[PDB]
Amino acid sequence: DKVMTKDLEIDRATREVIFKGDLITLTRTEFDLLLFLASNLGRVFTRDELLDHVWGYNHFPTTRTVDTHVLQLRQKLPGLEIETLRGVGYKMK
Amino acid sequence: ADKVMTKDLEIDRATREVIFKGDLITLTRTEFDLLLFLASNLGRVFTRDELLDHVWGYNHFPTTRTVDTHVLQLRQKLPGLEIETLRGVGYKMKA
Structure with a gap:
C-alpha cells in the first residue's frame, strides 16, 4: 500500500508524498514518475521507458x-x- | 515543383500521392510526411527524435x-x- 525508501513515504492510493518528514505536493505526472522510480530501486530506466510508464502507452507519438x-x-x-x-x-x- | 523524385520513387507534395516502381501507393498522412522528409534529404542520417520532431511536430506532446x-x-x-x-x-x- 505504502512505498518506502530512505527519504520517501508514498501512498499510491492518495497521491500522498512524505519526504524527510514533510508533506510535499507533486503534480500527477511528477507523482507517477517518483512512484515508478521509488518502486524500482537500483534499476536504470531509459528516458524512453520512463516516458511510457509515466505518461502511459499510445497517447502520443514516441x-x-x-x-x-x-x-x-x-x-x-x-x-x-x-x-x-x-x-x-x-x-x- | 510539386514532385520529389528518387530511385523508383515519385512523390507529389501537393496531391500527396506516392508512385513507387510504377504503382500508386496509399500511405497514411504521417507515413507520407516521413517518406517525403527522408526522400528530400537523401544520404543524411536522422535520429529517431529528430524524425519525431520533424514529422509529428516539435513541442506538440511529451517527449x-x-x-x-x-x-x-x-x-x-x-x-x-x-x-x-x-x-x-x-x-x-x-x-
Whole structure:
C-alpha cells in the first residue's frame, strides 16, 4: 500500500508524498514518475521507458512510432532504400 | 515543383500521392510526411527524435525531454532526493 525508501513515504492510493518528514505536493505526472522510480530501486530506466510508464502507452507519438512507421513504409514500398543505423537512426540512400 | 523524385520513387507534395516502381501507393498522412522528409534529404542520417520532431511536430506532446524536465522538478521539490542521472541514457533512484 505504502512505498518506502530512505527519504520517501508514498501512498499510491492518495497521491500522498512524505519526504524527510514533510508533506510535499507533486503534480500527477511528477507523482507517477517518483512512484515508478521509488518502486524500482537500483534499476536504470531509459528516458524512453520512463516516458511510457509515466505518461502511459499510445497517447502520443514516441521514438517507437518512428521505428514502426519505417517498417510500414518498407512493407508498402518493397525494396525502399532506407538504411538502418542500429543504435542511431535512419537514412534514405 | 510539386514532385520529389528518387530511385523508383515519385512523390507529389501537393496531391500527396506516392508512385513507387510504377504503382500508386496509399500511405497514411504521417507515413507520407516521413517518406517525403527522408526522400528530400537523401544520404543524411536522422535520429529517431529528430524524425519525431520533424514529422509529428516539435513541442506538440511529451517527449524524453519532458522526462528530463520532470526529474529536475522532482529534485527541486524534494531537495536531496537521490535520483542519479545516467548521461544520455536515463535515470535511477539509488535508495
